[PDB]
Amino acid sequence: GQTADWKSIGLYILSFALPIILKALYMLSTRGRQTIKENKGTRIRFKDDSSYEEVNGIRKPRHLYVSMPTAQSTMKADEITPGRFRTIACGLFPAQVKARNIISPVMGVIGFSFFVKDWMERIDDFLAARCPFLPEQKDPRDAALATNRAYFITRQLQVDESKVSDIEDLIADARAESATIFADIATPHSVWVFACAPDRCPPTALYVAGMPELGAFFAILQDMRNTIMSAFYQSYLRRTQSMGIQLDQKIIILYMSHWGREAVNHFHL
């Protein structure tokens, strides 16, 4: 699909109290098929005491509604599907997801908890390392120009021109509501946007150099693990690239060469 209205879907979600969002995300991330096949009707209704409206001065509960898995078909661009909800909420609240250690089993079994354990050091070591396909500088002091960090700056300058107004709008409106958004992969919660296994790169992270590709790295591990025991990478690729950016396949190679062997040793088999 390509046609999701993230600005609008994001407006809806950001107007809710956090505890009801985290409940919905939790339920649909770790109990997805279990909550769907027990839901009466066309919508999945979440309740929470944190979530209320006032109807002419009187306080009344405000439920969060996600619409059941429509197999495409009647999908309004506006429609908050389980997949669309997960994707956007993952990007909007990764620090809160981290704080609660919410992890989708789908990510847990490719060793996500071990992987993000010392994430800040792990990403730093990655960015500090030599990038095989940048040349060596002839002045020894310019050596940083040959690192993965250098390569991500060029990537950042490249993704900056492929920005769409509606996703920049959503990002704008995310800041205006104190969401735990971020501008750089080298930040404590960047990797946590994938804890709940969004089906694509979350829109608010699309334009941070390396992020769409990080999600792709995880998806390939899913396929790898699945092989050891599926189209996780191809599905993620298709859906992410339908948001209007193309993945940098060179970055995925860097991620895999750096982290691949160790990741496999931490699969749950």
Side-chain angles (χ1 to χ4, degrees):
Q2 176 174 88
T3 65
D5 180 4
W6 298 114
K7 175 177 186 52
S8 155
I9 286 163
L11 285 205
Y12 183 71
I13 283 136
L14 289 159
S15 74
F16 282 91
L18 207 90
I20 197 168
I21 306 299
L22 297 177
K23 183 190 230 131
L25 186 63
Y26 174 75
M27 290 312 286
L28 296 179
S29 287
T30 72
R31 281 150 207 277
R33 82 170 65 98
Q34 287 78 23
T35 57
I36 284 171
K37 270 209 171 174
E38 299 174 16
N39 240 275
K40 263 204 175 186
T42 39
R43 308 176 299 167
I44 297 163
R45 176 189 62 169
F46 296 100
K47 327 170 193 191
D48 196 78
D49 290 348
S50 69
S51 177
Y52 50 88
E53 281 183 333
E54 40 288 335
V55 188
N56 289 325
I58 293 191
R59 220 179 246 192
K60 271 159 177 188
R62 196 202 175 193
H63 306 143
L64 208 188
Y65 292 103
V66 174
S67 72
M68 293 282 291
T70 42
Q72 292 298 313
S73 65
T74 68
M75 274 213 318
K76 309 303 198 66
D78 235 346
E79 200 166 331
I80 307 141
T81 67
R84 286 175 172 175
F85 171 85
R86 279 167 69 165
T87 292
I88 188 155
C90 287
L92 287 179
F93 311 111
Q96 295 89 344
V97 171
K98 176 182 198 285
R100 281 144 192 83
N101 201 42
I102 303 190
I103 308 177
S104 168
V106 145
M107 296 301 295
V109 293
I110 55 172
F112 183 86
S113 305
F114 174 78
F115 182 82
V116 308
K117 182 123 57 199
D118 280 291
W119 166 251
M120 273 303 273
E121 181 195 8
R122 170 167 227 125
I123 190 57
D124 188 77
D125 290 345
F126 176 85
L127 291 175
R130 164 91 148 98
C131 172
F133 40 82
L134 289 179
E136 192 83 57
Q137 291 292 316
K138 53 181 52 176
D139 189 346
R141 289 168 297 188
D142 297 337
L145 296 185
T147 59
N148 287 333
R149 195 171 328 263
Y151 183 77
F152 276 43
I153 291 157
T154 80
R155 175 63 174 159
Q156 188 60 77
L157 272 40
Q158 172 182 63
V159 310
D160 275 345
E161 299 192 14
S162 211
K163 289 191 192 161
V164 185
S165 26
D166 278 296
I167 295 188
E168 292 191 278
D169 288 342
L170 171 64
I171 289 178
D173 296 324
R175 192 179 75 80
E177 308 292 331
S178 292
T180 57
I181 241 77
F182 55 88
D184 213 285
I185 191 165
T187 58
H189 322 295
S190 66
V191 65
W192 274 89
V193 311
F194 298 109
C196 287
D199 64 352
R200 68 200 39 151
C201 184
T204 48
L206 241 204
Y207 305 138
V208 177
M211 286 307 288
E213 291 83 6
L214 184 56
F217 160 79
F218 285 132
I220 293 174
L221 297 181
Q222 305 180 263
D223 287 325
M224 230 162 287
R225 173 191 187 271
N226 201 264
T227 287
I228 287 157
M229 319 276 318
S230 87
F232 293 108
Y233 165 69
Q234 302 292 340
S235 302
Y236 176 88
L237 177 72
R238 178 161 68 164
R239 282 157 142 148
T240 304
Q241 291 193 149
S242 83
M243 291 185 283
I245 196 185
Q246 292 278 287
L247 262 52
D248 188 326
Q249 294 291 320
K250 296 199 272 189
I251 299 183
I252 304 184
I253 290 168
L254 299 178
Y255 285 156
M256 201 59 61
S257 60
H258 268 252
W259 293 328
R261 176 170 190 176
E262 173 190 5
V264 159
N265 292 321
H266 293 85
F267 288 173
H268 186 264
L269 314 172

